């Protein structure tokens, strides 16, 4: 309801996500997605194109 | 006062023989003059050779851009001097009035 | 001429809809009522003749031709020869005393606009050139000369015109480089943003046609929403991810227009909705936006299929660097379409080669390419230099 | 040919947007078939 949060907050999170990815991506790399799918608790689509994304 | 006296690179190899033309030599000079503890001494750092590795690519990729300037060393030459004697002899050549 | 040459357009695109037809012509066997458009109206009904532009009282009257507003009749003719004669009679002796009184230099210059201008409501492709011409011959303002750009603005895009306007268009603002001030340069880089559209622009006045907006538009040279279209789909179509993400992600521009026209609902609407990294939803979003821009819009025609498989390669650039390793299964199998024909025209992108794209048909997958230290960089380098050194081999071809 | 195009690459091929269309309903027809 609040456009601002809808805006804003949810990307923001989506940013922490990433951030978190981002921190998850830290470990190196060849490594399966549903590791950090899992790590995080996310369908590995679900993380693919927000991590390809970045 | 030095300058008053006197009046680019092959010399730079010049020298590579020359220590190692004794060096072996003064092994078997001292093996063989002796037949000390420094050669040893020397003999570790020999391995300081063979060591190349594919970082010898970053060479070659150097290497690369070294020539880049190549067809703009040249490239002055390449249109510098060659349309020089063309504004000159038309000139010239043509002069020629009376 | 503005709606007059798209209803040309249209109505000559007539292909999708009767309405394509209809709606076009529609105005026009109005418009033609409205300004005595016959002389081209005339060859206008020869511009989609021959196809179904066969149906006319004066050209060519045809059952294959599903337009019969294609059609005439003398008496437009005679309302023109009146209208026409009516506005030259009127000009003539007008003129002739601007002539007459040495009646103001532009003031001159000002029935001549005049009596050009009917030309534009007339469909001649003449006088109003000379009229503009001799309204030129008495222009002493670049304002008039803004009028050259309008003139020969409207002269071209009556038609829908090429070179020589754009040739003008530059001519016109060679003169002086002012642009209008501020604006000219818009018409200019609108126009030219047109001129280049044909049928390019592609990334060339593209982004000039996104960029200045709105600040002009002509009607009967062009609408807003048109360079918004327009400008938008092709440097969408073009520009980057970041400069569209960056820009058309959205404007208080688009803001305004956002489905306002629905005459978009696609371009980066559904293009964004690519851009999002969709796979399906945007491979109808294409032909959808496509029959509902390309065909719709004169360059949008015209060019085709320039824009269609890009973005269609062009997702797979990200959807390649998203994977190194992707299965193409994964992609067109997964992805709910043909593979096959997919892959076909995905594979007419090997030959293309701007696939990084390392590709199977049978395991179906796909893998990535690199520029490295090879690039175009340490790349291109072979052919730039010999391209001069055949230059340099002209150089000492001279000699003598 | 006209006078000028946008030139080159050359003027390729055509029959596509529709004929994908086409299949854009049916690779997604496919797909709805799936």
Known sequence: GDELTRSHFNALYDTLLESNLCKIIEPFECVEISHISKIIGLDTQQVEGKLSQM | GVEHLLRIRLTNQLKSLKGLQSKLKDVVEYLDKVIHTILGKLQDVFNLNNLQKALTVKTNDELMVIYISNLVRSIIAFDDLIENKIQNKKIQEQRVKD | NYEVSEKAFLLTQSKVSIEQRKEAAEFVLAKIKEEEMAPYYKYLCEEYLVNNGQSDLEHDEKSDSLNEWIKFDQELYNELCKKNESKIKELNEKIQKLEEDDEGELEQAQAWINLGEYYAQIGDKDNAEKTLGKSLSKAISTGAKIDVMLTIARLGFFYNDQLYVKEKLEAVNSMIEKGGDWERRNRYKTYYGIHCLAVRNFKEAAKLLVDSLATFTSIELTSYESIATYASVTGLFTLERTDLKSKVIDSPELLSLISTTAALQSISSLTISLYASDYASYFPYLLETYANVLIPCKYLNRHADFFVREMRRKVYAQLLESYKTLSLKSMASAFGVSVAFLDNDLGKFIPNKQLNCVIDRVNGIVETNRPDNKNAQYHLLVKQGDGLLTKLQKYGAAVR | ?34
């Not at chain 4, 529709?18 to 299949?23: A, D, I, M, P, R």
């Open chain 4, 1 to 34: 040919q006209t006078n000028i195009w946008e030139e080159n690459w050359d003027d390729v091929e055509v029959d596509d947007d529709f004929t994908n269309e086409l299949k854009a309903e049916l690779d997604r027809y496919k797909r709805e078939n799936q």
